[PDB]
Amino acid sequence: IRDLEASIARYKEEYAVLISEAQAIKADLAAVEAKVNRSTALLKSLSA
Amino acid sequence: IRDLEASIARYKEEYAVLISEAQAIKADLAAVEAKVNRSTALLKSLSA
Amino acid sequence: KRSDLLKLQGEFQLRLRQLEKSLLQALNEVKGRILDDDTIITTLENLKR
Amino acid sequence: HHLQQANIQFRTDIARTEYLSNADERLRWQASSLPADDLCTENAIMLK
Amino acid sequence: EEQQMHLNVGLRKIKETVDQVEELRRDLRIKSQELEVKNAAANDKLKKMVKDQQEAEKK
Amino acid sequence: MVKDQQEAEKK
């Protein structure tokens, strides 16, 4: 039981690390989406 | 069972949000540690 | 009022030419990546207004 | 007419004042007490 | 001549911006796929925790 | 989460 609890704790630490990486990717995705919208406005204006 | 699965999805989303906030706090803590170390070296040098 | 309106039109044309010169200088003086800095985007938002 | 006879290329659809003066200095001349006619504009162009 | 040079600088920035927009769209798709993959791995880890907890409760 | 998973497994 103690070994299984230690394995659960280590696996939940790896789970937290994976969620950290996924949410960093999500924040980068939001930044890229904002940059894409700004670049689309830039593309329209400088097309004019 | 469908309601339990929906509650599972909501609880895991709240879990992900809480882990996201905790890891943002951890990144802020690491930045604060770096600032504390730099400011302590600065304090020693400018005390001299 | 017509004289004041003509003065306003002249000031507006001066504003057009200042925008043209500012946009040319901004696009010429970066010497790098346009999409990197947000100062360029802020300046072009001012140009859009 | 002589340039047309000699086949020297010149742009017909342009005004002398607009070719030889900037709009900034035209506005500055109008501010500093100059009449708005084209002869006075040409005279200011000669004066500069 | 300098007016044409300033025009040519601006058009090169236009082509660079178009290429950067294409690269940003590709990177957006790549990051979305990476986020989905990491979410699937996180769900697999959650199932691993559930299975380990069930095994510990049974034993 | 574990309690809800156990309840769903039971029912």
Residue numbers in the entry:
A (entry chain A), B (entry chain B): 3437 to 3484
C (entry chain A): 3727 to 3775
D (entry chain A): 3534 to 3581
E (entry chain A): 3195 to 3253
F (entry chain B): 3243 to 3253
How does the study describe this entry?
Cytoplasmic dynein-1 is a conserved, minus-end-directed microtubule motor critical for cell division and long-range intracellular transport in eukaryotic cells. Dynein, a member of the AAA + (ATPase associated with various cellular activities) family, forms a 1.4 MDa dimer composed of two copies each of heavy (HC), intermediate (IC), light intermediate (LIC), and three (TCTEX, LC8, and ROBL) light chains (LC), with the IC, LIC, and LC known as accessory chains. Cellular and structural studies have shown that dynein primarily exists in a pseudo-twofold symmetric, autoinhibited Phi state incompatible with movement along microtubules. LIS1 plays essential roles in the activation of dynein, including relieving autoinhibition and helping assemble the fully active DDA transport complexes.
To visualize the conformational landscape of dynein activation by LIS1, we incubated full-length human dynein with ATP and LIS1 at room temperature for 5 minutes. We identified three major species: individual dynein motors (Open), Phi, and a third state similar to Phi but with two LIS1 β-propellers bound to dynein, which we termed Pre-Chi. For Phi, we obtained a 2.7 Å structure of the motor domain and a 4.4 Å structure of the tail. Phi dynein has pseudo-two-fold symmetry; the motor domains have true two-fold symmetry, but that symmetry is broken in the tails. The nucleotide state of Pre-Chi is the same as that of Phi.
